[PDB]
């Protein structure tokens, strides 16, 4: 429109309907100058890593990116804690994005001094991928999201991606993209941009936790029709025994249905006062290979964190670790972190730091003695039932299934909805200005250029439907609550600096309903 | 329009239909101020010249001009490659031209 | 038909549309009579086989059989260069066979 | 149809209307099986060659083709002399052509006997390159021909072609075509093939002499207002005198046009009784070269083959060299040859054998004498004016244009009309017929085959535009006319043992028009 007219409102709400909420939040956003308007190629080699694990190449691109893939850029904690204690499964629905309220600035320095001032004729350039071709980054556990508190301003991050890489070196497979070769709109002052998506269709995310154990859904009163072998030896003849599968022997009886797959990870502690034999942080550490790669299996398959009563033991590298507002980057304490656990999951999943069971490994006679191994990995077989990993509320939303021939329940390990057609990346870039050029033609490009950045708001609304719940249960669920009892802060409130801080990791699974 | 409305997107892309690709470019520009607007007399005494086969008499303008004449101004690599691996021949059809955005300081 | 009549012709040519291609192929071929027109019963016993994992029991009829279940017989390879080099992706659609001029001597 | 009917009746006859003249002609042929059907590389390794000069790469076919690109195979003797003595031009028009009749043996040899029979149910293969995505070997003069005579038996020429080498090897560039990749028909012996061709716009063919020459074109009665340098020395002082170019001096007068290019050509006499100097027929010819190979300039532009009283002498490449019925294929005496000549031309075209003209080489001073060069080749000159090369009732009709960038006067060089869409190539196989296989399979691709061949007659009629003659000449023309003088044979008839011979080229040029 104009330079002295808004572009957008503040909108930050929720609306709870009967089947449906509607989430919107609004933040205020900088974007500085990245690269100083380049290209320029990066690899292990430019940053001075070593290892052929962590080997790389790849772009860093000028322009940034708009990412809000986690569930606390949207839900309040109020709004989570309801979801969560009054719903069985919610997923997203549809999608609407909006940047207005923009505004350039320049930046001068003249002797240790800068000075700020609006450049009104300058532009900022946003496009979205929604053919995606371009490397979706959205989906990692990236910073740089909406901030969870709508008061904070936050720092757009800088888009880069990789390609393929031998060492540090790229092949002629490796692809280079230009994301000035993609149409985009230049925003003035006075523009906006807004674009609408609609979330494919998405299996309920699980916000329930299993009343029943999967080895427990029999009849407690009733015999089974069946038998099993219950002795071999008289007291070496061998005699053949059989007996009635019934409630005085559960583990024996016939079963449809068996536990999900199995990745076994190392088992880790977090009692003090503790000796370990060495460290086995990586060389203990479950792992999978590609093309001579060896990367962590982390989070891996969805398996219980621990067994039960065993809330001090936590998989090596099978659960998500979040940090605590002001936790450091680099070798920070145990209780600098939130270890989630999920342990709900335990009755249909196996245990992450357990064995999945025993399998015969040689035929037993009068001569040798029947032999079982430990299955320490188990893939899919038939009758197989888990629950996937659970979400949080700082937690990632969907990701990007990669696009291959053939998948299997392409769920996001680190949990969330998988989607072959996830929403598109939002990137966002200040047109670069030139300086003053030289009055004599120069075929260089230019390299001097006016010191900017841009600041704004934007604007997100994601509407989820809801799936109530229906049960027949008799005396009362448990329920996601604060704690009555006093304390220096209010938990999810800001201290007396300002400051916001998460003080836990909320989950989804609080009701319950029958396996 | 005004001066807080932008007067033109950035287009850059590759369109390929039957028998017909489209190349769309965009650049962005600087113009200094030549000659310090005066048009000036040049020849190869004012540059220095000797020699007859260099000899030459002009005029130098305040004005720039845009050239686009450079086939990689509008085919990408892969767009080259595509056009070349695949086609017995091309020709230019029609042209579109736009300015916008502009900005003087 | 009749004796002295072609009952079809020699179609072999692909021809390259937008989002398909159609491949046909035609040749020329020879059937023998096959187990002198009867049905044998077969083994590794027949054969000479002696080793568990290569024993086997079945039959031989008297009947050929067409196959053409490998991409050569329909792709030229500048065909199947057009194909890799300009496609993502393909799969075959509709079938159409034909048999003719048989000629039985 | 069927075994028992005829699939085409026989057409051979000529239809004079006013300004068209429509030519049927029907031929009996015989085809065999080439390369007992197979495609064979060939190069000058597998026959031979040692000169890289006339080093190959190509492939033989299976295939036979049907070529018709010689007058005789449509005009009479008598039809051609009533074409060049009442026409000043003419040009194809319209092409019928039909394969009818189609008879396949098969061939038996007990020991040393040879047995034929029909085999009604095998088939012949027929198709046009109607898109000229084959090379096209039409454009050349080669044997295979529908014969002069009709009732001459011919044999179908197997099809072969060339493509990029180096040496005896192939290059990354080299086509290989494989003629079972076309769509054809197949007919048994009672089936018939044709199709109808439309030719191209060409110019009228000059089947006439002019009757005044370019540098006779003034009025010799009436000077020119122009003056001309008649002399320099007063008999050293420069003393310019000018003078009126008048009837008294015709060859300083100024004229508007000049005659055609030329590429100077060696001159041999036929003379008897002569002696030369060396072996001058490859080392004295006049040649073009060609990624390092050297191809004679045969027959080269269009240039008159000799000056006024000098039959004896012909340009040692620049003539074509028709055989005489029953000449040998290998160093022939002259007397068995018959040497076409041009000299109809010499109105417009500068001579073979001489200098196009002089050219100032230098600057005349009082110190310096002035120098002139000899002209031994002159390109396209604006202004310049030439008649293309006649045909010959022996001689080719049309050749196909090379694809390529850019082309000056397509004229084809040996004489005919020049076409980007020529006629296209008719190309015809015998179907291969497998012997007995073996009762046990095998995956060899079959190499016993019925010994077969076929036979049947060939029809093509092609509609000709005449140009009449409007001229007001009072005196007789010159026309080509039989010689009433007693002989032992009746030329252009057959022999007392049926040979049909042609005793003499016969051009087209014997009516007159000014320039």
Avoid at 148 to 168: E, K
Avoid at 382 to 405: N, S
Wanted: proline fraction near 7%; hydrophobic fraction near 30%.
């Amino acid at each position: 429109d104009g330079v002295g007219s808004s572009s957008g409102n503040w909108h930050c709400d929720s609306q709870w309907l009967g089947d449906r909420v509607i989430t919107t939040s609004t933040r205020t956003w900088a974007l500085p100058t990245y690269n100083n308007h380049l290209y320029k190629q990066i690899s292990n080699s430019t940053s001075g890593g070593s290892s052929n694990d962590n080997a790389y190449f790849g772009y860093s691109t000028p322009w940034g990116y708009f990412d809000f893939n986690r569930f606390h850029c949207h839900f309040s904690p109020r709004d989570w804690q309801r979801l969560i204690n009054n719903n069985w499964g919610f997923r997203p629905k549809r999608l609407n994005f909006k940047l207005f309220n923009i505004q350039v600035k320049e930046v001068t320095d003249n002797n240790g001094v800068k000075t700020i001032a609006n450049n009104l004729t300058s532009t900022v350039q946003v496009f979205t991928d929604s053919d995606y071709q371009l490397p979706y980054v959205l989906g990692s556990a990236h910073e740089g999201c909406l901030p969870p508190f709508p008061a904070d301003v936050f720092m757009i991050p800088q888009y880069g991606y990789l390609t393929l890489n031998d060492g540090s070196q790229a092949v002629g497979r490796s692809s280079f993209y230009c994301l000035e070769y993609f149409p985009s709109q230049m925003l003035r002052t006075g523009n906006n941009f807004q674009f609408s998506y609609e979330f494919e269709n998405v299996p309920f995310h699980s916000s329930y936790a299993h009343s029943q154990s999967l080895d427990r859904l029999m009849n407690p009163l009733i015999d089974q029709y069946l038998y099993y072998l219950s002795k071999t030896i008289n007291g070496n003849q061998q005699t053949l025994k059989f007996s009635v599968a019934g409630p005085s022997n559960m583990a024996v009886q016939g079963r449809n249905y068996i536990p999900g797959p199995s990745y076994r990870q190392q088992r880790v502690s977090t009692t003090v006062t503790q000796a370990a034999a060495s460290e086995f942080a990586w060389p203990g550490a479950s792992s999978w290979a590609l093309n001579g790669r060896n990367s962590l299996m982390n989070p891996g398959p969805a398996m219980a964190s621990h067994k039960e009563g065993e809330d001090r033991f936590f998989p090596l590298s099978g659960s998500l670790i979040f940090g605590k507002q002001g936790t450091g980057r680099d070798n920070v304490d145990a209780d600098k972190v939130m270890i989630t656990n999920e342990e709900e999951i335990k009755t249909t999943n196996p245990v992450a730091t357990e064995s999945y069971g025993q399998v015969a490994t040689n035929h037993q006679s009068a001569q040798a003695q029947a032999q079982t191994g430990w299955v320490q990995n188990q893939g899919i077989l038939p009758g197989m039932v888990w629950q996937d990993r659970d979400v949080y509320l700082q937690g990632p939303i969907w990701a990007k299934i990669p696009h291959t021939d053939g998948n299997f329940h392409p769920s996001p390990l680190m949990g969330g909805f998988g989607m072959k057609h996830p929403p598109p990346q939002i990137l966002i870039k200040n047109t670069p200005v030139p300086a003053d050029p030289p009055t004599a033609f120069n075929k260089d490009k230019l390299n001097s250029f006016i010191t900017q950045y841009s600041t704004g708001q934007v604007s997100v609304e994601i509407e989820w439907e809801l799936q109530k719940e229906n049960s027949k249960r008799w005396n009362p669920e448990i329920q996601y609550t604060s704690n009555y009892y006093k304390s220096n802060n209010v938990e999810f409130a800001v201290n007396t600096e300002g400051v916001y801080s998460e003080p836990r990791p909320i989950g989804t699974r609080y009701l319950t309903r029958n396996l």
